C-alpha cells in the first residue's frame with residue numbers, strides 16, 4: 253500500500269541510511285539514480301507540521317551546493333522525498349579517511365560550504381545544524397549541503413554557545429559559529445571542543461578556548477578567531493566571509509554564492525525530451541513544468557537536466 257505509487261516511477265535499491273530511512277533508487281524514465289527519504293506520518297506525530305516546513309524551504313532552495321529535491325509523494329502513511337543521490341558520501345567520512353585536509357584542500361571545500369550557507373541566508377533561512385554529516389559529495393566530487401535532522405528554519409559539538417543555553421539567537425550567527433567548527437575539523441581532523449561528558453563539553457563551548465595545532469598557518473588561526481567568538485555580535489558577518497583574505501588566497505575572487513540552477517529559465521532540450529512522454533503539446537508542457545508542483549513531471553524535468561549536465 254505505502255510503496256505502490258512510488259514503484260510506478262522508481263526501481264528501489266538498498267537502504268543507504270537511517271535516522272527517516274533513505275533508500276537508493278533509480279528513476280525509471282531517465283535511468284538517473286536518486287536517494288529517497290522515507291518518513292512515517294504516525295511515527296512523526298506532533299513533529300509532522302515541521303516536515304511540511306522543511307519541504308517548503310527545500311522547494312525554495314535550488315543551488316549548485318544544495319542537495320536537489322525532485323519529487324514529494326504523500327500516501328496514507330508515508331511522506332517520500334526524492335532527492336539528489338551523492339555517491340561520494342559524507343564529508344564526515346572523507347575527513348576521517350584523509351586524517352585531516354591541507355589548508356589548500358580545506359579552502360577548496362570551505363568555499364563550497366560558504367557558497368551554500370550564504371545562499372541559504374540570502375533566501376531568508378538559517379540551517380542551524382551545520383556539521384560534516386550534513387555535507388555530501390556528488391558524482392563530480394563537489395559538496396552538497398543537506399539537513400537530515402529537520403533543523404533549518406525560515407550536534408552539540410557544532411552548536412553555538414547561545415543555541416545551547418536556550419537564549420534567543422540569530423540563525424545566521426549560529427551558522428557562522430558552526431562553520432568555524434567545520435573549518436577547524438577540516439584542518440585538524442578533530443573537534444576544537446570535545447569531551448566524553450556532555451556537561452564538561454558544554455563548559456568548554458561556553459568558555460571558547462581551544463588548542464591551536466602547530467600546522468595551522470597564521471591566516472587560518474585569524475579566520476578561526478573571527479568565526480569562533482562566544483559573543484555572537486563579535487562573529488564575522490557572512491558578507492565579510494565571502495571576500496575574507498583567507499578565503500581569497502589562491503583564488504582572488506569572492507565566493508560565488510548566487511544560484512546557477514534556475515526556476516525561471518527552462519532548458520529547451522529537456523522540455524523537448526520530456527514532451528515525447530506526454531500526449532500534450534509543447535506549450536502545455538512548459539506551463540506545467542513552470543508550476544513546480546514537485547510531482548513526477550518536476551522529477552523528470554530536473555533529472556533530464558542532471559543527465560544533460562553529465563554530457
Ligand SMILES: COc1cccc(Nc2ncc(-c3ccc(C(=O)NCC(=O)Nc4ccccc4)cc3)c(OCC3CCNCC3)n2)c1
Pocket residue numbers: 268269270274287289306309310313318319335336337338339340341342372379385386388397398399400404
Ligand atoms: C556511497 O555511500 C554513501 C554514504 C553516505 C551518503 C550517500 N549518499 C546520499 N545521497 C543523498 C542522501 C540524502 C540527501 C538529502 C537528504 C535530506 O534529508 N534532505 C533535506 C535537505 O537537504 N534539506 C535542506 C538542505 C539545505 C538547507 C535547508 C534544508 C537525505 C538523504 C543520503 O542520505 C544518507 C544520510 C545518512 C545519514 N547521514 C546523512 C546522509 N545519502 C552515499
